[PDB]
Coordinates of C-alpha atoms and ligand atoms in Angstrom, one line a residue:
X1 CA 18.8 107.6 207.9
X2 CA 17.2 110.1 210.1
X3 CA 16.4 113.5 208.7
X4 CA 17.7 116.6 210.4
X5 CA 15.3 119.4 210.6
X6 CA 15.7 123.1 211.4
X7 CA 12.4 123.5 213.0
X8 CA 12.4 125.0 216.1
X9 CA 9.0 124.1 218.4
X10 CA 9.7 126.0 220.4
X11 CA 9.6 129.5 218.1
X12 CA 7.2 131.7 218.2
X13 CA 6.7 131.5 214.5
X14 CA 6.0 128.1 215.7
X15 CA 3.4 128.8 218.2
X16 CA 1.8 131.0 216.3
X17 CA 0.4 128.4 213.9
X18 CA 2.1 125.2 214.6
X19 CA 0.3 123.0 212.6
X20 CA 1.6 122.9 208.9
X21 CA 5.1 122.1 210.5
X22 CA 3.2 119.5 212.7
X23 CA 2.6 117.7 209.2
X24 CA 6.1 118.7 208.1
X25 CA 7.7 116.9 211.3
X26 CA 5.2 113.6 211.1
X27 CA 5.7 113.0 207.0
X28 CA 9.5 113.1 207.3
X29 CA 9.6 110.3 209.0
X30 CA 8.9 108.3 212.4
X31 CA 11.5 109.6 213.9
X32 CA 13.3 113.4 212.9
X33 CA 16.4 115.0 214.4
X34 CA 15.7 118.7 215.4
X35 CA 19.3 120.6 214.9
X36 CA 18.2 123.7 216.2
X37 CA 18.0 121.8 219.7
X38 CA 19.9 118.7 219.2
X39 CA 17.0 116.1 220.8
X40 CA 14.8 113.9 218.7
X41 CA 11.5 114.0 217.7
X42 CA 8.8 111.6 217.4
X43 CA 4.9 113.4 215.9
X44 CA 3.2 110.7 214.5
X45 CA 0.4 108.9 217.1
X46 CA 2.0 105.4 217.1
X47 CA 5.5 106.4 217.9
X48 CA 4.5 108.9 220.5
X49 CA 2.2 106.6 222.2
X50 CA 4.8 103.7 222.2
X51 CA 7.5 106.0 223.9
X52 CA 5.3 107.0 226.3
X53 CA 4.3 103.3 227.2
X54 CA 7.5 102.6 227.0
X55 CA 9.2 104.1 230.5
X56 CA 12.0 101.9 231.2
X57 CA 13.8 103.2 227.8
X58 CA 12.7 106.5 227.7
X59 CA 12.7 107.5 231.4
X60 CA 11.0 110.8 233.5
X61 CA 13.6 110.7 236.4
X62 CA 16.5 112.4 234.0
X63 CA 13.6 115.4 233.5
X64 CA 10.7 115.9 231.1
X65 CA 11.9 119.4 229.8
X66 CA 15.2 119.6 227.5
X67 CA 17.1 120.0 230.5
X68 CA 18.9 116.4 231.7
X69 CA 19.0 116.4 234.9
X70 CA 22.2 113.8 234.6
X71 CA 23.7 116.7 233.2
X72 CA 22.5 120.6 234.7
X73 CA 20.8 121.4 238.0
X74 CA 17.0 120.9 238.0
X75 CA 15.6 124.8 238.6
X76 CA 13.6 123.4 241.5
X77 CA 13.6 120.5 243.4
X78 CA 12.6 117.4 240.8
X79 CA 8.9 116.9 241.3
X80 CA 8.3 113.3 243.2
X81 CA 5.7 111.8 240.5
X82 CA 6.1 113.3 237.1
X83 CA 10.2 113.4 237.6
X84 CA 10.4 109.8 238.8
X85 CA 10.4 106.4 237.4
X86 CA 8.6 103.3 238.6
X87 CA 9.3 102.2 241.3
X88 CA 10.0 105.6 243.2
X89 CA 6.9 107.3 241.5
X90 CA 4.8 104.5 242.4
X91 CA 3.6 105.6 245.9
X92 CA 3.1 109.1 245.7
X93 CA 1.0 108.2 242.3
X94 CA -0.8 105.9 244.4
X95 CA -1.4 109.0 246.9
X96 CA -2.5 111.5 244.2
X97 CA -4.5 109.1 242.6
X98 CA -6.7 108.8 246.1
X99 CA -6.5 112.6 246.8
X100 CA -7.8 113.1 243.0
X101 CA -10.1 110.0 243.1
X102 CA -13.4 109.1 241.6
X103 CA -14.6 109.1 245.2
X104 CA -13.3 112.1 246.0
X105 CA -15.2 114.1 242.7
X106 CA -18.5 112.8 244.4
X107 CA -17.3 115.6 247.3
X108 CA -16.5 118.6 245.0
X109 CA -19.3 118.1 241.9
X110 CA -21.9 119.9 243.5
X111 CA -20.2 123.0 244.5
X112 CA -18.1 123.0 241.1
X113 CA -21.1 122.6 239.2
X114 CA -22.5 125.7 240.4
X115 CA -20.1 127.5 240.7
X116 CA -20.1 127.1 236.1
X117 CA -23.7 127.5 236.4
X118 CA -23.2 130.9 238.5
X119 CA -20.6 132.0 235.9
X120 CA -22.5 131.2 233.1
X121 CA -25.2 133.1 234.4
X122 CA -22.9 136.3 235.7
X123 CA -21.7 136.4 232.2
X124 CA -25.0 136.1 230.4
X125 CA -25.7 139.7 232.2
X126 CA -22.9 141.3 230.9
X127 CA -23.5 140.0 227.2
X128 CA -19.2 141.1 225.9
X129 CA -16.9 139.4 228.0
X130 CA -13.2 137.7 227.5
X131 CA -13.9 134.0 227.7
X132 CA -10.3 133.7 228.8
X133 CA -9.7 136.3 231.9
X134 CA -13.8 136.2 232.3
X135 CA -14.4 132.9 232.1
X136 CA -11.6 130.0 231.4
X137 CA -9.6 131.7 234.1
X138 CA -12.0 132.9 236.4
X139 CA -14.1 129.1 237.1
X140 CA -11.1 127.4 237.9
X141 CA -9.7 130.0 240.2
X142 CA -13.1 130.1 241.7
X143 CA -13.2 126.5 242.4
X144 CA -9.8 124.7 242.6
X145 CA -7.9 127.5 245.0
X146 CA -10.6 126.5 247.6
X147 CA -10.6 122.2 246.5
X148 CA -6.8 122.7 247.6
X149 CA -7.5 124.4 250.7
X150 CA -5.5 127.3 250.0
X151 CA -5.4 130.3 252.1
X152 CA -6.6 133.3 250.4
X153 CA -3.2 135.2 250.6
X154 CA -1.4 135.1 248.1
X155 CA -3.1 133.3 244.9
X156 CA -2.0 136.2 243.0
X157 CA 1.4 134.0 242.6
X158 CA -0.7 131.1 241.0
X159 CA -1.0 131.4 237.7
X160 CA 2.5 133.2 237.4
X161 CA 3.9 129.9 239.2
X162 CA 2.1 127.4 236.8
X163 CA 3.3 129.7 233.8
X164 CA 6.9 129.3 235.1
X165 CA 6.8 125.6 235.7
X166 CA 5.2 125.1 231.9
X167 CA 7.9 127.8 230.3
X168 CA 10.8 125.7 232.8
X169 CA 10.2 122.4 230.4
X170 CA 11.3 124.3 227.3
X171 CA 14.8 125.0 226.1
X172 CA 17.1 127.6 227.3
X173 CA 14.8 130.2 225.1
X174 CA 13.7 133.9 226.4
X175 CA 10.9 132.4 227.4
X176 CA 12.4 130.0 229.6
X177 CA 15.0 132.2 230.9
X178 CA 12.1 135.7 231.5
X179 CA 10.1 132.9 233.2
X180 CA 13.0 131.6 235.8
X181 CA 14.6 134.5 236.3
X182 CA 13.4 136.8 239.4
X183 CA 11.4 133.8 240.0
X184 CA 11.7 133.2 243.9
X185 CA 9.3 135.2 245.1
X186 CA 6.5 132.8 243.0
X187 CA 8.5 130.0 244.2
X188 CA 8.4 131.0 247.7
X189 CA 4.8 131.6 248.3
X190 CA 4.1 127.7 246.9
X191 CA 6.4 125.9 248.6
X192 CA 4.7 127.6 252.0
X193 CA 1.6 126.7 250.9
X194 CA 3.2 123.0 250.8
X195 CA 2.9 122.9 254.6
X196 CA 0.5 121.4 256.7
X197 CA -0.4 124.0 258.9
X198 CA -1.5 126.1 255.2
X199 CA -3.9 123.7 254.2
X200 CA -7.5 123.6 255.5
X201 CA -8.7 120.5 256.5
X202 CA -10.7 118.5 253.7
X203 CA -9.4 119.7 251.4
X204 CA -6.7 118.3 248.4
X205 CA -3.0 119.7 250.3
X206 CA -4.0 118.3 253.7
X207 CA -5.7 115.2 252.5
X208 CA -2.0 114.6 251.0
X209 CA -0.7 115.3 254.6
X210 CA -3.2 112.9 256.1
X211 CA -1.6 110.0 253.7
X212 CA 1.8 110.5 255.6
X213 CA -0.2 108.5 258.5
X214 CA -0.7 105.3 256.3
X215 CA 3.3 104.6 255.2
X216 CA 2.8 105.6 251.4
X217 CA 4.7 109.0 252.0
X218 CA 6.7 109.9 254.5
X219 CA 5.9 113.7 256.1
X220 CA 9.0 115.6 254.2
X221 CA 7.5 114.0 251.2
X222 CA 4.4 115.5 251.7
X223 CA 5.3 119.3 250.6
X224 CA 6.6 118.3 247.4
X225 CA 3.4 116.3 246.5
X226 CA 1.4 119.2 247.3
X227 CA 3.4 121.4 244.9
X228 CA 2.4 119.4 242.6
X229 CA -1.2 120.2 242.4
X230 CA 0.0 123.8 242.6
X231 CA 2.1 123.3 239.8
X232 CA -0.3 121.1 237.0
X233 CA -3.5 121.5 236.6
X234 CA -4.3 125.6 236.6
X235 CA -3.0 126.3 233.3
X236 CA -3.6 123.2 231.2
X237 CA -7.4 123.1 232.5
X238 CA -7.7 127.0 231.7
X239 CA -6.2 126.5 228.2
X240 CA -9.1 123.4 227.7
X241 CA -11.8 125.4 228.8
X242 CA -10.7 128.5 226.4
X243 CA -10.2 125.9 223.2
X244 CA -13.5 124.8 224.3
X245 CA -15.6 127.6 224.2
X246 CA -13.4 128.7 221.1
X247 CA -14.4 125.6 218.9
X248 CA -18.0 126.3 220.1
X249 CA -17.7 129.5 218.9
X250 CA -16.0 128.6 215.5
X251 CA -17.8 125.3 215.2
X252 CA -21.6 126.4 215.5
X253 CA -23.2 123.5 214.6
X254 CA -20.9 121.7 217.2
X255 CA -22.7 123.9 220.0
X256 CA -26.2 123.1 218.2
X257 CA -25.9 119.6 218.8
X258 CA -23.9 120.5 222.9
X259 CA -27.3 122.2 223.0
X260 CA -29.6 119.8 222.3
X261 CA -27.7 116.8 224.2
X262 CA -26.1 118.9 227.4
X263 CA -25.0 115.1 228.2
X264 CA -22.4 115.4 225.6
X265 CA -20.7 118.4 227.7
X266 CA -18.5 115.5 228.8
X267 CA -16.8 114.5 225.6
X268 CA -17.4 117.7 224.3
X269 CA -14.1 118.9 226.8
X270 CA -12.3 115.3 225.7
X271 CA -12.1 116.7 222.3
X272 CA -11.2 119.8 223.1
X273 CA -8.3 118.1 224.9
X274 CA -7.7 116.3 222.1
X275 CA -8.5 119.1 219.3
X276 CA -6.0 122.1 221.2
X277 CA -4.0 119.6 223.4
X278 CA -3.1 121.7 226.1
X279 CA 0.2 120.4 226.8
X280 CA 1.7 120.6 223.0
X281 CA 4.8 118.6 224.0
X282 CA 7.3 117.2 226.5
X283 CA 10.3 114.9 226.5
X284 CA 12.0 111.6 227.6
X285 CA 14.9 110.9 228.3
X286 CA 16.5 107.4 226.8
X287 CA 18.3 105.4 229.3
X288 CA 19.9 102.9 226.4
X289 CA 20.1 102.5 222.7
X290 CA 16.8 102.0 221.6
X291 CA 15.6 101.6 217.9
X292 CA 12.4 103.6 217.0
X293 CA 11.1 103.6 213.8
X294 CA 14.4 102.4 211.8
X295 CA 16.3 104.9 213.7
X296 CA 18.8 103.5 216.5
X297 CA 19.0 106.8 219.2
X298 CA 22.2 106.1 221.8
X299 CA 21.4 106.2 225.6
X300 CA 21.1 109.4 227.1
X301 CA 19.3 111.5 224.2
X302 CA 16.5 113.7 225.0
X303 CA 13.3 112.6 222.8
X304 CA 10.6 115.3 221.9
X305 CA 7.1 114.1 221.5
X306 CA 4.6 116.3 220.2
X307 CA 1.5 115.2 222.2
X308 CA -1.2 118.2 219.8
X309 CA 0.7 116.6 216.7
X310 CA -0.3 112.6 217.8
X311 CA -3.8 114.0 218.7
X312 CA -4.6 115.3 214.5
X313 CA -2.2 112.4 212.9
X314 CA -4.3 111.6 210.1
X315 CA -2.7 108.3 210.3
X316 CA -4.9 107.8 213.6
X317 CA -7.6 110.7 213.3
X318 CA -10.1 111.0 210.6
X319 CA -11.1 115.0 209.9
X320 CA -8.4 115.6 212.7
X321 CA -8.8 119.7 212.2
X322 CA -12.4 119.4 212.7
X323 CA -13.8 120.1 216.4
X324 CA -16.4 117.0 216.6
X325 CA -18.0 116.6 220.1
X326 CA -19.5 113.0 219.3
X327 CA -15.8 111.7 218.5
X328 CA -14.5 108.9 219.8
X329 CA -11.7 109.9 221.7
X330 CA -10.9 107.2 223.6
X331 CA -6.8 106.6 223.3
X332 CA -6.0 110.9 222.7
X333 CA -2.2 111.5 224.1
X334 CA -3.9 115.1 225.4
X335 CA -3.7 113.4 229.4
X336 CA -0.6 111.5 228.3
X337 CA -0.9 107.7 228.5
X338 CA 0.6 104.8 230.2
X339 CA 2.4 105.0 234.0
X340 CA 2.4 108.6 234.1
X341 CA -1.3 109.7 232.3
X342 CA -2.2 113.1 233.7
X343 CA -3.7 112.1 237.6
X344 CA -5.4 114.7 237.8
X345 CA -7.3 114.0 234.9
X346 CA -10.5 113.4 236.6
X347 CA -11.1 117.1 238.4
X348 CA -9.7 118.3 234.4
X349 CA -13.2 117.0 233.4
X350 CA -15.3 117.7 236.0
X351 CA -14.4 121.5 235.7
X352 CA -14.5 121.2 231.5
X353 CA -17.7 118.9 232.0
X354 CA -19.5 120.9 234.4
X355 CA -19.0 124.6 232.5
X356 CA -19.4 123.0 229.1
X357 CA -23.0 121.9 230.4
X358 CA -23.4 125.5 231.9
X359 CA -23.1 126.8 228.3
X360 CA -25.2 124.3 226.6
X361 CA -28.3 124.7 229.3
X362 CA -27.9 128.8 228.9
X363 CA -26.0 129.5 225.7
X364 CA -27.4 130.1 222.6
X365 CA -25.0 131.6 220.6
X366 CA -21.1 132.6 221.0
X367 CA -19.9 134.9 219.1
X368 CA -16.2 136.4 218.4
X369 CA -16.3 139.9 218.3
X370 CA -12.9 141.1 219.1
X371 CA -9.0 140.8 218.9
X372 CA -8.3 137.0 219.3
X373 CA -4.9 136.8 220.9
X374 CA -2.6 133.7 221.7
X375 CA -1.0 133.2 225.0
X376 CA 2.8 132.3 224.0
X377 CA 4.3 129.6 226.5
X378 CA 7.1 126.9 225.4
X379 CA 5.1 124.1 226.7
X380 CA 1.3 125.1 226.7
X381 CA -1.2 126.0 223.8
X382 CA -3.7 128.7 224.6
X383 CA -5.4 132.1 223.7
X384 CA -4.8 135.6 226.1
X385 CA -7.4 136.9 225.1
X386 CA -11.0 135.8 223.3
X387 CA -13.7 138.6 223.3
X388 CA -17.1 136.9 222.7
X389 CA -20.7 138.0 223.0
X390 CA -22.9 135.4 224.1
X391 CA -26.9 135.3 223.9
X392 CA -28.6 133.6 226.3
X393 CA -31.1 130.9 225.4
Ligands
HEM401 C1 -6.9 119.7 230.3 C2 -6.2 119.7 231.5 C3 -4.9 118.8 231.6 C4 -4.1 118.3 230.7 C5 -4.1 118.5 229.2 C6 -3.0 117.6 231.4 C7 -1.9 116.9 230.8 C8 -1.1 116.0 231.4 C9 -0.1 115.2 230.8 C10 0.1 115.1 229.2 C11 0.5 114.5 231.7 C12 1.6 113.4 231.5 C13 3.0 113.9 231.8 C14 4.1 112.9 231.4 O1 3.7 111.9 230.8 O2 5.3 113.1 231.5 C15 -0.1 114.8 233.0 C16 0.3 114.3 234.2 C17 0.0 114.9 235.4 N1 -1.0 115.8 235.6 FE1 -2.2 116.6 234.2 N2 -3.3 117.6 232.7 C18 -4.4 118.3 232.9 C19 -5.0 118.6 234.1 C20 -4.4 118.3 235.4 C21 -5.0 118.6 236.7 C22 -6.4 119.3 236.9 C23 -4.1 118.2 237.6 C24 -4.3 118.2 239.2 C25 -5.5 118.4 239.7 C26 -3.0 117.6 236.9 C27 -1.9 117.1 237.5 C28 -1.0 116.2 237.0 C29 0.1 115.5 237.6 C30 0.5 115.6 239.1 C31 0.7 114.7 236.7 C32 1.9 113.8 236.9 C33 1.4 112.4 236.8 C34 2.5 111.3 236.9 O3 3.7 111.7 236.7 O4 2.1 110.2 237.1 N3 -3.2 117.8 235.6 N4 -1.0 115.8 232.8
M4F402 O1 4.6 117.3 239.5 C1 4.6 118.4 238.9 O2 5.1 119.4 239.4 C2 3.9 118.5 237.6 C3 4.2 119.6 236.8 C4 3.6 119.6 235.5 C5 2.7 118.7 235.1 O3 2.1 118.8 233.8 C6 2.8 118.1 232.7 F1 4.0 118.7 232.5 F2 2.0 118.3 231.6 F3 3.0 116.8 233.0 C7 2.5 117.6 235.9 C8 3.1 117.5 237.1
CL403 CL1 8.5 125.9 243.9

């Protein structure tokens, strides 16, 4: 009753251009059977966003890669929030959701904002730049390295680390296994930045270590919440920004209209979110027999939702391959949704908001003129490399 596909999601076919098997995977059916991995697979927007509102049957705390935790080792120690179920993931949420909160973006928007402006500008002199290493990676590694409070020693191992954790959700690929193995020495520079005495004051690792005081973590929690924000965040909001400026590039009249409403740089990032999804997929695990469109799945299967797939269901989405910045995107599975939607969600959109209004105040045009390459990673969607030339307005 439940058809068995040989589509692996985790190719690099796959990758490459995932999107006709996207259709493949949501027109079979509600709910598919992936052979080549043994899980199952939900693509369509309703089913995805009812498992993922759904965390008492398909739990986090048995892992959100393939790996079950019931079953292997965890590579690293399980994270405290996106590993756990309610009610252990309840008070470190509570804690990252003050650290990252709308109170605390009134703190960073003004330095973050120029900082896009002063790369916007930097760029504009140069005229041929990579909007990936030049730009989508440089702003936030210009900003969010210093929100943290990191030392500067050492942020080499940042992006690396991120790259690993992203690769570590996959399957027991080459990817997967490249990423983990010889790992350690990525591995050890974060978890010593996870300690008090590495964080400056004010900033996002010790304003975790302050929240030890207040009985919502306890202080050899504390390091594990911070590694957190070391581990989410980098990669996904780097990928955003690239798919961002990409679309605006490939979607002219889409940057026309940025241009003549900068107020839209806002929702203008929200559909990039929604358009590239950043984080492509990840998996629950189900803690009982559960029936899901027609299909009965026993307890203890691992269940594949393809968050990019949910965001351009055509079920849900009208035009879902067009990049449309007036969109409503209000209930996009690109942050997740329900008990675990992305917490960091609202420094995501400050940093996408604040460069995507950089570009629409001095950007006229962006133009491709180079080799486009993809950046291959079994959990994340994202270019290596986008050559544009961009003329100033
Ligand atoms: C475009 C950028 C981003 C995207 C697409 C994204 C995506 C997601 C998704 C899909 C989830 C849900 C995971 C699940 O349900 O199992 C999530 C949760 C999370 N995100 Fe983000 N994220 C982004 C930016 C960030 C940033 C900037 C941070 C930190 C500053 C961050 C930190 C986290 C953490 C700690 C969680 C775990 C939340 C929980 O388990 O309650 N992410 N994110
Ligand atoms: O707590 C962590 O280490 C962590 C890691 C990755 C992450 O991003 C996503 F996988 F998309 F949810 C969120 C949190
Ligand atoms: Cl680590």
């Amino acid at each position: 009753t439940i058809p068995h596909l040989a589509i692996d999601p985790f190719s690099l076919d796959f990758f490459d251009d995932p999107y006709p098997d996207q259709q493949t995977l949501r027109d079979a059916g509600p709910v598919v059977y992936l052979d080549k991995w043994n899980v199952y697979g939900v693509a369509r927007y309703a089913e995805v966003h009812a498992v993922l509102n759904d965390p008492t049957t398909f739990c986090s705390s048995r892992g959100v890669g393939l790996s079950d935790f019931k079953k292997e080792k965890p590579w690293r120690p399980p994270s405290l929030i996106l590993e756990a179920d309610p009610p252990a993931h309840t008070r470190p949420r509570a804690v990252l959701s003050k650290v990252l909160s709308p109170a605390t973006m009134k703190t960073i928007r003004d330095g973050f904002a120029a900082a896009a402006d002063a790369k916007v500008d930097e760029l504009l002199q140069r005229g041929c730049i990579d909007a990936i290493a030049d730009l989508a990676e440089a702003y936030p590694l210009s900003v969010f390295p210093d929100a943290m409070g990191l030392k500067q020693e050492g942020r080499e191992h940042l992006l690396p680390y991120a790259g690993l954790v992203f690769n570590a959700f996959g399957p027991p690929n080459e990817l997967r296994q490249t990423a983990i193995e010889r790992s350690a020495p990525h591995q050890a520079y974060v978890n010593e930045q996870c300690q008090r005495p590495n964080l400056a004051p004010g900033g996002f690792g010790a304003c975790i270590h302050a929240f030890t005081d207040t009985g919502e973590i306890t202080p050899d929690e504390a390091p594990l919440l911070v590694r957190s924000l070391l581990s989410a965040g980098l990669d996904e909001t780097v990928n955003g920004i690239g798919a961002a400026v990409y679309c605006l590039a490939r979607f002219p009249g889409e940057l026309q209209r940025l241009r003549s409403d900068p107020t839209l740089a806002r929702n203008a990032f929200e559909e990039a979110v929604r358009f590239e999804s950043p984080v492509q997929t990840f998996f629950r695990t189900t803690t009982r027999e559960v029936e899901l469109g027609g299909a009965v799945i026993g307890e203890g299967e691992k269940v594949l939702m393809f968050l990019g797939s949910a965001n351009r269901d055509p079920r849900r989405w009208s035009d879902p391959d067009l990049y449309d910045i007036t969109r409503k995107t209000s209930g996009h599975v690109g942050f997740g949704s329900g008990v675990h939607m992305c917490v960091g969600q609202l420094v995501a959109r400050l940093e996408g908001e604040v460069m995507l209004s950089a570009l629409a105040r001095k950007v006229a045009a962006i133009d491709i003129d180079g080799p486009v390459k993809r950046r291959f990673n079994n959990t994340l969607r994202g270019l290596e490399s986008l050559p544009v030339k961009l003329t100033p307005a």
